[PDB]
UniProtKB/Swiss-Prot annotation, chains A, B:
Tissue specificity comment: Expressed in all adult and embryonic tissues.
Cross-link named Glycyl lysine isopeptide (Lys-Gly) (interchain with G-Cter in SUMO2), sites: K15
Full protein name: Chromobox protein homolog 1
Subunit structure as annotated in this protein's UniProt entry: Homodimer. Interacts directly with CHAF1A, EMSY, LBR, TIF1/TIF1A and TRIM28/TIF1B PXVXL motif via the chromoshadow domain. Interacts directly with histone H3 methylated at 'Lys-9' via the chromo domain. Interacts with SUV39H1 and SETDB1, KMT5B and KMT5C. Interacts with PRDM6. Interacts with POGZ. Interacts with CHAMP1. Interacts with INCENP. Interacts with SGO1; the CBX1 homodimer binds to one molecule of SGO1. Interacts with LRIF1 (via PxVxL motif). Interacts with HDGFL2. Interacts with CHD3. Interacts with CHD4.
Positions marked as site (Histone H3A7 binding): V5, L22, W24, L40, C42
Domain Chromo stretches: 3-51
UniProt organism field: Homo sapiens
Described function: Component of heterochromatin. Recognizes and binds histone H3 tails methylated at 'Lys-9', leading to epigenetic repression. Interaction with lamin B receptor (LBR) can contribute to the association of the heterochromatin with the inner nuclear membrane.
Subcellular location, record wording: Nucleus
Site feature location: Histone H3K9me2 binding: Y3, W24, F27
Post-translational modification: Not phosphorylated. Ubiquitinated.
Length: 51, 51
C-alpha cells in the first residue's frame, strides 16, 4: 500500500515532457521507474538531485 | 516523496499482464493509474477489491 521514493537519480526531457528516474523503498535498483513530474510532489528529493 | 494507495478500484488482464487500477492518497480521481501487479505488494487493499 505504501510507496516511498528513496532517491531522485536522474531527469530527462523527452518530447517536452519532464520525467524523473526514481529509486523506490523496498524495491530493487532493477525496478527504478521514470515518472512524469506532474505527480512528483517531492522538494527534498528533487533539491538533492539538483545539487 | 510518499505515495499511498487508498483503494484498489479494478483489475484487468491485457495480453496476459495483470494490472490494477489504483486511487492515490492526495491525488484526484482523475490521476488514478493502472499498475502492473508485480510491484503491488498490498494484501488489505487487494482483498478489499476481491470482496
Amino acid at each position: 500500500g505504501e510507496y516511498v521514493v528513496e532517491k531522485v537519480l536522474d531527469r530527462r526531457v523527452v518530447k517536452g515532457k519532464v520525467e524523473y528516474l526514481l529509486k523506490w523503498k523496498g524495491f530493487s535498483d532493477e525496478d527504478n521507474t521514470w515518472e512524469p513530474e506532474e505527480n512528483l510532489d517531492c522538494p527534498d528529493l528533487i533539491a538533492e538531485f539538483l545539487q
